[PDB]
Design a protein around this ligand. Structure first.
Ligand SMILES: Nc1nc2c(ncn2[C@@H]2O[C@@H]3COP(=O)(O)O[C@H]4[C@@H](O)[C@H](n5cnc6c(N)ncnc65)O[C@@H]4COP(=O)(O)O[C@H]3[C@H]2O)c(=O)[nH]1
Ligand SMILES: *[C@@H]1O[C@H](CO)[C@@H](O[C@@H]2O[C@H](CO)[C@@H](O[C@H]3O[C@H](CO)[C@@H](O)[C@H](O)[C@@H]3O)[C@H](O)[C@H]2NC(C)=O)[C@H](O)[C@H]1NC(C)=O
Ligand SMILES: *[C@@H]1O[C@H](CO)[C@@H](O)[C@H](O)[C@H]1NC(C)=O
Ligand SMILES: *[C@@H]1O[C@H](CO)[C@@H](O)[C@H](O)[C@H]1NC(C)=O
Ligand SMILES: *[C@@H]1O[C@H](CO)[C@@H](O)[C@H](O)[C@H]1NC(C)=O
Ligand SMILES: [Ca+2]
Ligand SMILES: [Cl-]
Ligand SMILES: [Cl-]
Ligand SMILES: [Cl-]
Ligand SMILES: [Cl-]
Ligand SMILES: [Cl-]
Ligand SMILES: [Cl-]
Ligand SMILES: [Zn+2]
Ligand SMILES: [Zn+2]
Length: 725
């Protein structure tokens, strides 16, 4: 009898032959196996269906951007974003190397491309052997290390021979046998490209790899290993149907230029042809602006790379061109029709939250649960998991160690909340009152005399913790919100408040009206007079003064100088619509929301909060005062899973996070032709982010006082919703 015909039985303990002290881990990639293939054609794939039903499965493993083979395979084995591990696409130009990378060039074997630490190198350093039958990077000497057994990539090797070789490796004596293995097949990616994802050729390709996995499982059973091996069946990305009618050609807007090179496809990038001499002097911004808002409902958008949504984490590599393009589902871009492959084939590379880009993940073996279906997770999380399976300490990476513990029968690593590394103080009322130059309207109720339940109301999940190392913060308590105030930057790092479903906003105006918070040092850029007619810059509020839960008028404590941030007039359009219109609707839909908002400073576009050194280099002198202008603003919205519960009494949390670019115009949204502001909601959706994304870029940590385990909270904070096509 074959493995697939046996009944599914629980493997609570590894059932291993005498020559095996612990089960190995095998990482098995089916290139271009989009998650939906199993959703729809599972009945035709008996082998992979048994792995899913007898193992641990997610409907969608989220890939990394761009959704191509080399970035994503190397992300899986490093736990790193492509921008950090250096393999940002299958084809790259490095201006400092003055060298081009591609899959059919000898540069593919040059170790200088491959950063980070792949799991076989991690294993080597910790006395664990590896055998790789193809995997990007595995035929390259990385950190002076090669897998104990490896194969130089050769796509012509029959799939059966690859599986048989691994099965022979598993028969090696213990002192030479690897503990970690890889297998890689080019299908169903090959048929998806040549014939499209919805084709009889892809179905044949899916049946072929299903029989090949069965061949693997049958071999393990013959060796007595089918209950002594942790299998991770995975893919690098999904597949989409391209069209010649959904292809953007830049020469429509630029003319038939030849001084630029465009990496064609859905995640296209642009650089001058005269490199490296002009790689940094080229006027990318002028080119980006010439390509912006040219068509109604334009299906491509130019982005200078720091302006891409942070959730993509696609900017901190010199191999990522300063100009990139973001493409709608099914759409691709090239310089002209001669600079691209066939426009009607299957393709991938698009936004890693598009449903058809989602990837496969099944875990099967002693370590994995039986019949468990788990929420989506990113493939950068798998490196830590394989480390736990192999008894390895992981190298530093972007996965959140412990966030996949719910996949395992018995979690290996027990995660902790990060320590608060800030310096916390109390801010005393010890500021001499000064004229702010404000002209408050008569209906603004002043703060004439400045001199537990409220705390829980404003931070019902616990206050955000300051991860910023040695940063000086004091907590400012108000009746309706809590502020984490930076004494080093003289502006608030976050404000937290709860917006109940029946709470009303005030209609009154409050222009050019502030009250000096006598608990903080007075700065010239705290005053109304500084921003008066300041064409360069205005100010905005973290907590909305119109929200007043007790009284009918403007909430005067929200007018404190500790509650304002520098803010462009252009961004005020977004911020005002968010708070005057969207938040009220979200609170109706969610039965209230808790809100935390604040500034972000990521001037070096690495997705992490900036050092003091970096902030000093990016300060601006405006109206004879040094001022630090945020690069983004964050907002985190939290409510209950059960709609009968208000945010102060959640049995379980629902979280939405956003990292909004703080730009001095709204060219990103193409608003010249618009007479209503719903485009603000589209901008929010595009720039949604994991809670963990916000934590990394602000040095803050949320929800630490909740009773859920740390791993459960990591699951909440790493989640990101998929755009359903
Ligand atoms: N729109 C479109 N794009 C295509 C088509 N055919 C290929 N592409 C693209 O060219 C790349 C080369 O595919 P290949 O068939 O020549 O080699 C395959 C495979 O042989 C190769 N490869 C896989 N592992 C490798 C490895 N370890 N080393 C070197 N090359 C490797 O990667 C390629 C698939 O990864 P990919 O889809 O992200 O990139 C494709 C893909 O993005 C096509 O028909 N239509
Ligand atoms: C994703 O995880 C990466 C690995 O932890 C992380 O990259 C690391 O970033 C730090 C901080 O920039 C670098 O640390 C050192 O950088 C230079 C040395 O080159 C020093 O001047 C610094 O003081 C510091 O010691 C690491 O070199 C870097 N590691 C790698 C492999 O890139 C990324 O930041 C993470 N990405 C996100 C968005 O969180
Ligand atoms: C960059 O490398 C290419 C090799 O493809 C070479 O032709 C060119 O002269 C080099 N330019 C500089 C400035 O080094
Ligand atoms: C690739 O493998 C095939 C066998 O499947 C072999 O004929 C061919 O010579 C190999 N290529 C190289 C460069 O070794
Ligand atoms: C278009 O590009 C030119 C350079 O060729 C630049 O001077 C101009 O400012 C750009 N147009 C816009 C609207 O930015
Ligand atoms: Ca930064
Ligand atoms: Cl790099
Ligand atoms: Cl390139
Ligand atoms: Cl278009
Ligand atoms: Cl492609
Ligand atoms: Cl195990
Ligand atoms: Cl709780
Ligand atoms: Zn692929
Ligand atoms: Zn492909």
């Amino acid at each position: 009898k074959s493995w697939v015909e046996e009944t599914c039985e629980s493997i609570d303990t590894p059932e291993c032959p005498a020559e095996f002290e612990s089960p190995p881990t095998l990482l098995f990639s089916l290139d271009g196996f989009r998650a939906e293939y199993l959703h729809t054609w599972g009945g035709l794939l008996p082998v992979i269906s048994k792995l899913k039903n007898c193992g641990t499965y997610t409907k969608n493993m989220r890939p990394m951007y761009p959704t191509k083979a080399f970035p994503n395979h190397y992300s899986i084995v490093t736990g790193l974003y492509p921008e950090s591990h250096g393999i940002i696409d299958n084809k790259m130009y490095d201006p400092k190397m003055n060298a081009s990378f591609s899959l059919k060039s000898k540069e593919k074997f040059n170790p200088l491309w491959y950063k980070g630490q792949p799991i076989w190198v991690t294993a080597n350093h910790q006395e664990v052997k590896s055998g790789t039958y193809f995997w990007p990077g595995s035929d390259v000497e990385i950190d002076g290390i090669l897998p104990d057994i490896y194969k130089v990539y050769n796509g012509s090797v029959p799939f059966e021979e690859r599986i048989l070789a691994v099965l022979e490796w598993l028969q090696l004596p213990s002192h030479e046998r690897p503990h970690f293995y890889t297998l890689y097949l080019e299908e169903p990616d090959s048929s998806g490209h040549s014939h499209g994802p919805v084709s009889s050729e892809v179905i044949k390709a899916l049946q072929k790899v299903d029989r090949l996995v069965g061949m693997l499982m049958d071999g393990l059973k013959d060796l007595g290993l089918d209950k002594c091996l942790n299998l991770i069946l995975i893919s690098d990305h999904g597949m989409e149907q391209g069209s010649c009618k959904k292809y953007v050609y830049l020469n429509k807007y630029l003319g038939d230029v030849n001084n630029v090179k465009v990496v064609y496809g859905p995640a296209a990038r642009l650089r001058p042809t005269d490199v490296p001499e002009t790689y940094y002097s080229f006027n990318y911004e002028a080119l980006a602006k010439n390509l912006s808002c040219r068509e109604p409902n334009q299906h491509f958008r130019p982005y200078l790379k720091p302006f891409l949504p942070k959730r993509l984490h696609f900017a901190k590599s010199d191999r990522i061109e300063p100009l990139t393009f973001y493409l709608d589902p099914q759409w691709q871009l090239a310089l002209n029709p001669s600079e691209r492959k066939y426009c009607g084939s299957g393709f991938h590379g698009s936004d890693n939250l598009f449903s058809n880009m989602q990837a496969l993940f099944i875990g099967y073996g002693p370590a994995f649960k039986h019949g468990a279906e788990v929420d989506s997770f990113e493939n950068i999380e798998v490196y830590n998991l394989m480390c736990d399976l192999l008894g390895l300490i992981p190298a530093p990476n972007n996965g959140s160690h412990g966030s996949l513990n719910h996949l395992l029968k018995k979690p290996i690593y027990n995660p902790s909340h990060p320590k608060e590394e800030g310096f916390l103080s109390q801010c005393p009322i010890k500021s001499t009152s000064n004229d702010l130059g404000c002209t408050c309207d008569p209906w603004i109720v002043p703060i004439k005399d400045f001199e537990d339940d409220i705390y829980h109301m404003t931070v019902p999940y616990g206050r955000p913790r300051i991860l910023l190392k040695q940063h000086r913060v004091c907590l400012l308590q108000q009746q309706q919100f809590l502020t984490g105030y930076s004494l080093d930057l003289l502006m608030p790092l976050w404000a937290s408040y709860t917006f109940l479903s029946n709470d009303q906003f005030s209609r009154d105006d409050f222009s050019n009206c502030l009250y000096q918070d006598l608990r903080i040092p007075l700065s010239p850029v705290h005053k109304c007079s500084y921003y008066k007619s300041n064409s360069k810059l205005s100010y905005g509020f973290l907590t909305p003064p119109r929200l007043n839960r007790v009284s009918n008028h403007i909430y005067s404590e929200a007018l404190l100088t500790s509650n304002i941030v520098p803010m462009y007039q252009s961004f005020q359009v977004i911020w005002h619509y968010l708070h005057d219109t969207l938040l009220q609707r979200y609170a109706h839909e969610r039965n209230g929301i808790n809100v935390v908002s604040g500034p972000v400073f990521d001037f070096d576009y690495d997705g992490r909060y900036d050092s003091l050194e970096i902030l000093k280099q990016n300060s601006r002198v405006i109206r004879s005062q040094e001022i630090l202008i945020p690069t983004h603003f964050f907002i985190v919205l939290t409510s209950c899973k059960q709609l009968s519960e208000t945010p102060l009494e959640c049995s379980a949390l629902e979280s939405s996070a956003y990292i909004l670019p703080h730009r001095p115009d709204n060219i990103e949204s193409c608003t010249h032709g618009k007479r209503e502001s719903s485009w603000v909601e589209e901008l929010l959706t595009l720039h949604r982010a994991r809670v963990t994304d916000v934590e990394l870029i602000t040095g803050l940590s949320f929800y630490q006082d909740r009773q859920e385990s740390v791993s459960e909270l990591l699951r909440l904070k790493t989640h990101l919703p998929i755009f359903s096509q």
